[PDB]
Amino acid sequence: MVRGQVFDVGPRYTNLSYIGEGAYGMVCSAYDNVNKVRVAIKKISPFEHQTYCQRTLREIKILLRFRHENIIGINDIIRAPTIEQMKDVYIVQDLMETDLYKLLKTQHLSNDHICYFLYQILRGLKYIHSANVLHRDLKPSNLLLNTTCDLKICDFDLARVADLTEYVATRWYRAPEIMLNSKGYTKSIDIWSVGCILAEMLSNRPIFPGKHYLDQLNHILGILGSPSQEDLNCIINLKARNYLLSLPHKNKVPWNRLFPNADSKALDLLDKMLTFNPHKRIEVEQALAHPYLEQYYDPSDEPIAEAPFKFDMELDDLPKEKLKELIFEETARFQPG
Secondary structure, three states: OEOOEOOOOOOOEEEEEEEEOOOOOOEEEEEEOOOOEEEEEEEEOOOOOHHHHHHHHHHHHHHHHOOOOOEOOEEEEEOOOOOOOOOOEEEEEEOOOEEHHHHHHHOOOOHHHHHHHHHHHHHHHHHHHHOOEEOOOOOHHHEEEOOOOOEEEOOOOOOEEOOOOOOOOOOOOOOHHHHOOOOOOOOHHHHHHHHHHHHHHHHOOOOOOOOOHHHHHHHHHHHHOOOOOOOOOOOOOHHHHHHHHHOOOOOOOOHHHHOOOOOHHHHHHHHHHOOOOOOOOOOHHHHHOOHHHOOOOOHHHOOOOOOOOOOOOOOOOOOHHHHHHHHHHHOOOOOOO
């Protein structure tokens, strides 16, 4: 009934209106007749591909467990009664006004907003990482905003527990570790992404807008300068390691030459976040205590996960059918009754 595709969210959710696409697939805005508000609903049909089952079930479990002001929550999950009948899954979330991607492309951002937005991202991320969870795909389009400048992290489809070759809308916000296929990436990849986002909030333009795979590193090395052999510490691709050393020695561009009107405090933190070496990269807890965020910093009003995360089984090994059963049992909560 919407854009040709069927949307069986009624009778609770009515007044449908198309928003955009996934991630998983079609997303629409509907009026919740129960809670008397408008909500966002994602339609998911993951039962064909095996990876889609992983990403769907992983996001469900994580988000249902999480409970934070700066993280989107799942209000409801609509699916068919029986398991064979269930071919689609509908996730209901709070309808946010806009995102950081829409905002940055059109309108200029003041320092106080940039500072406030940065604090909320890290505050939310703190809760994430404290739960030993990696978002892995942070970006301006994954940061939703409302009327009162409240920020919420979204789209945990590519998330996992801290211990790929799939398609993505953008690779501009990925750490060099991912680019260099460094098996054993940690929480530092999220920090890098927030760094790229900080930079984009300042200049209203992407900091590392590479056209493709190799071009991404050229923009990074162009600004940060060439890396040492010590930076090449982790078990990375031997050829990629050699290729990096074979490239011409580029010089580091001072941040104030890139961001002249930017606050010196913000640039200081920006530096610590966008360091090539993953281990030398600042941690979220230390990033919040940074002088730039002292106006909002408050350890007493920054909740964490009561206990770190751990899934019962490894979903990477389970087949397409057992994952459906796992999804079926995880969504059993919202079924009446």
